[PDB]
C-alpha cells in the first residue's frame, strides 16, 4: 500500500493546504509599514510565499498525476527551492528571536546598522548565503547525466557529481539544531527576565496597597508620612523595573509619573502635618491602582501571548519534522529494521514535512500579534 497511501493521505492534505496557506500568507507581502525594524517579518513573508508557490508541484509529483518530466522537474527544482526557503525561514525565526533577546534583556550590543543588530545587512546576507552558498545544487543537478530511470518512478535520486546534496541536507538540519538550541537560550532567558519584571511589579503594587491600607487606617502624621514614603519608594521602583520588561508596555513608563505625582502631593500634605486632609489625597491613589491593574492584567496577557507566540509556531512546525527525521536517517543506516516500519516512518516524515510547511498558514498569527502596524492595517482594511 506504499504506492497508494501517499496519493491518498499526504497528497490530499497538501492539496487542502495549498489553496489556503498561500492565500493567507500573501496578504503581508504589501508591507506599506516599517523601515528598519520589522523587515525580518517581511523576509519570512517572502520565504513562506515562495514555499507555497512551489508547493503545488509536490502534489503534482507524488500523486502520480504528472509525467516523468514533471517528476524530474520536481526533484531538480521544486524540492530544493522549498527546502532552502524552509531552512531560511527557521534561520529568520532565530534572528527575530535574537532581536527579541537583545532588545529586552541587555541594553546595547551595537552593530553596523541600528543599535540592536544590522537588520538590513543580515537580511541581505542570509538569503544570499542560503540560496546558493548553502545549496549549490540548482544547475548542478542535471540528472545523473542520464534520465529514463524507472520511467516516471525513481525520478529523484537522479543527480551527478557525487550527489553532494547528502552533505547539503545534513548541514541544513545541523544549523537548525543550532537555531533550535539558540531558542533554548534566547527564549528562556526572555522568560526568566519577563517573569522577574512581572514579579517586581507585583511586589511593588503589593507593598503600595499595604501602605495605602495603612494610610486608610492611620491616625496621625507619622503613620501617613511613613506610608507615603514607602509608597513613593515602591512607585519609583516599579517605574524603574517596568523599563526592563517587554516593549509592549511603553505607556507604563509614561503613566507612573502621574502615580508618583499624587503620592508626592500627599507626601507634602503629610509632611506639613495636615494628616487629616493628606489621607484624602491618598484616597485618590485608590483610584490610581484600580485604574492601573485594570490595564496591567490587560497587558500581561498581551506580552505573554506575544513572547510565547513564536516559540509556539517554531515548536509545532519545524521541530517535530526534525525529530522525525532522526529515526529516518538512523534506520536508513540500520537496515535491520522492518520494511513496514520504513513505510510508516516515511508516511510520518512526509506528514511532518506538511506540518512544517503549515508554518506558511501559521505565520499570519505572528504577523497579527507581533506587529502593531499590521494590526492598524488590518483594522483600517
Amino acid at each position: 500500500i506504499t504506492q497508494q497511501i501517499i496519493p491518498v493521505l499526504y497528497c490530499m492534505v497538501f492539496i487542502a493546504g495549498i489553496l489556503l496557506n498561500g492565500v493567507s500568507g500573501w496578504i503581508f507581502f504589501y508591507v506599506p509599514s516599517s523601515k528598519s525594524f520589522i523587515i525580518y517579518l517581511k523576509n519570512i513573508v517572502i520565504a513562506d510565499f515562495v514555499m507555497s508557490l512551489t508547493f503545488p508541484f509536490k502534489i503534482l509529483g507524488d500523486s502520480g498525476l504528472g509525467p516523468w518530466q514533471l517528476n524530474v522537474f520536481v526533484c531538480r527544482v521544486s524540492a530544493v527551492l522549498f527546502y532552502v526557503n524552509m531552512y531560511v525561514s527557521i534561520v529568520f525565526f532565530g534572528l527575530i528571536s535574537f532581536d527579541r533577546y537583545y532588545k529586552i534583556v541587555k541594553p546595547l550590543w551595537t552593530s553596523f546598522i541600528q543599535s540592536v543588530s544590522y537588520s538590513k545587512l543580515l537580511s541581505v546576507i542570509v538569503w544570499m548565503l542560503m540560496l546558493l552558498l548553502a545549496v549549490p545544487n540548482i544547475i548542478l543537478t542535471n540528472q545523473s547525466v542520464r534520465e529514463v530511470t524507472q520511467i516516471k518512478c525513481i525520478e529523484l535520486k537522479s543527480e551527478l557529481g557525487r550527489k553532494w546534496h547528502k552533505a547539503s541536507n545534513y548541514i541544513f538540519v545541523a544549523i537548525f539544531w543550532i537555531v533550535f538550541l539558540l531558542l533554548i537560550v534566547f527564549y528562556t532567558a526572555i522568560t526568566k527576565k519577563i517573569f522577574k519584571s512581572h514579579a517586581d511589579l507585583e511586589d511593588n503594587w503589593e507593598t503600595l496597597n499595604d501602605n495605602l491600607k495603612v494610610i486608610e487606617k492611620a491616625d496621625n502624621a507619622a503613620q501617613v508620612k511613613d506610608a507615603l514614603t514607602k509608597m513613593r519608594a515602591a512607585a519609583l521602583d516599579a517605574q524603574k523595573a517596568s523599563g526592563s520588561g517587554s516593549p509592549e508596555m511603553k505607556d507604563f513608563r509614561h503613566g507612573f509619573d502621574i502615580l508618583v505625582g499624587q503620592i508626592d502631593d500627599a507626601l507634602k500634605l503629610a509632611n506639613e502635618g495636615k494628616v487629616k486632609e493628606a489621607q484624602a489625597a491618598a484616597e485618590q491613589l485608590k483610584t490610581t491602582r484600580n485604574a492601573y491593574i485594570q490595564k496591567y492584567l490587560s497587558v500581561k496577557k498581551k506580552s505573554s501571548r506575544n513572547i510565547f507566540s513564536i516559540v509556539f509556531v517554531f515548536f509545532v512546525c519545524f521541530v517535530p519534522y526534525h525529530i522525525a527525521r532522526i529515526p529516518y536517517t538512523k534506520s536508513q543506516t540500520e537496515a535491520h529494521y522492518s520494511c513496514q516500519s520504513k513505510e510508516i516512518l516515511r508516511y510520518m516524515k512526509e506528514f511532518t514535512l506538511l506540518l512544517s510547511a503549515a508554518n506558511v498558514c501559521l505565520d499570519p498569527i505572528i504577523y497579527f500579534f507581533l506587529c502593531q502596524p499590521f494590526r492598524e492595517i488590518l483594522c483600517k482594511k
Partner: antibody, heavy 120, light 90 residues
Framework: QLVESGGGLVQPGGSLRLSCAAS????????MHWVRQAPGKGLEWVAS????????YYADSVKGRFTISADTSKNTAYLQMNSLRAEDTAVYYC???????????????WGQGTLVTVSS | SLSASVGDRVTITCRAS??????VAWYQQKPGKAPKLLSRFSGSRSGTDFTLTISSLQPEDFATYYC????????????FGQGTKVEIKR
C-alpha cells in the same frame, strides 16, 4: 474666582505666558489646570500644577512644549508656551478643582478664558 | 448633537472602557462661555456608558455637555468627551 490674561496674537514658534490670577484663595493649597478649547472644538486639558508639592502634569500633545509654574506671592499660575504651532489656537480656561485633589468632583471653578491665536 | 424640547427628559451618554466607580464629572458649557461643572441633572451608569439624565428640560439647559472620561484623577489627566449638544425641537 480666576481671571486669565496674556492671550493674543503670536506667530508660530513664538512663546506666550498666560497669567491666571486667583482671587478669594491662595494657589499654594490648590491645584491649577489649563483647559484649551479650539474654535468650534471640544475641551482639551493642557497642563496642571500643584504648588503645594510642586508636582506638574502635562497632556501628551503638549508635553515639553508648554511649562506651567506658579507664584504664590502674586497668587498667579503662569503657563509659558514655547514652540507654538498653528493648532495651539484656542481659548484657554484656568480651571481649579474644589479641593487640590478634588476628592471626586472635578474642575469645579473655572476662569473667564482668554484667546490665543497662532497665525502668521 | 441631539434635540429635545423644553420639559423633555434627556439622556446624554459618554463612552469609556473603565469599570471604576462612576466618578465622571459632567460639564455644561453654554455657547460662548466657560464650562460649568454639574437637582434635575442626575448621574447613572450602564456598563461602559456613563449617563447624564435631565428629568425636565429648562431653557438654560440647551448647552454642550462634556464628560471627564474615567481615569481622570490620579490628581490629573482630564480627558473630556467630544461633547453632546442639546438643541431645540421645532
Amino acid at each position: 474666582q480666576l481671571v486669565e490674561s496674556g492671550g493674543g496674537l503670536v506667530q508660530p514658534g513664538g512663546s506666550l505666558r498666560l497669567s491666571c490670577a486667583a482671587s478669594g484663595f491662595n494657589i499654594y493649597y490648590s491645584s491649577m489646570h489649563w483647559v484649551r478649547q479650539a474654535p468650534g472644538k471640544g475641551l482639551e486639558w493642557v497642563a496642571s500644577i500643584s504648588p503645594y508639592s510642586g508636582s506638574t502634569y502635562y497632556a501628551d500633545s503638549v508635553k515639553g512644549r508648554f511649562t506651567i509654574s506658579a507664584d504664590t506671592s502674586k497668587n498667579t499660575a503662569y503657563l509659558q508656551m514655547n514652540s507654538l504651532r498653528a493648532e495651539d489656537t484656542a481659548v484657554y480656561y484656568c480651571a481649579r478643582p474644589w479641593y487640590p485633589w478634588s476628592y471626586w468632583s472635578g474642575l469645579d471653578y473655572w476662569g473667564q478664558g482668554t484667546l490665543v491665536t497662532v497665525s502668521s | 448633537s441631539l434635540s429635545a424640547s423644553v420639559g423633555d427628559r434627556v439622556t446624554i451618554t459618554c463612552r469609556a472602557s473603565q469599570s471604576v466607580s462612576s466618578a465622571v464629572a459632567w460639564y455644561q458649557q453654554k455657547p460662548g462661555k466657560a464650562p460649568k461643572l454639574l437637582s434635575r441633572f442626575s448621574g447613572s451608569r450602564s456598563g461602559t456608558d456613563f449617563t447624564l439624565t435631565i428629568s425636565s428640560l429648562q431653557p438654560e439647559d440647551f448647552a454642550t455637555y462634556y464628560c471627564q472620561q474615567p481615569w481622570s484623577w490620579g490628581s490629573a489627566l482630564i480627558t473630556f468627551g467630544q461633547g453632546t449638544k442639546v438643541e431645540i425641537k421645532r
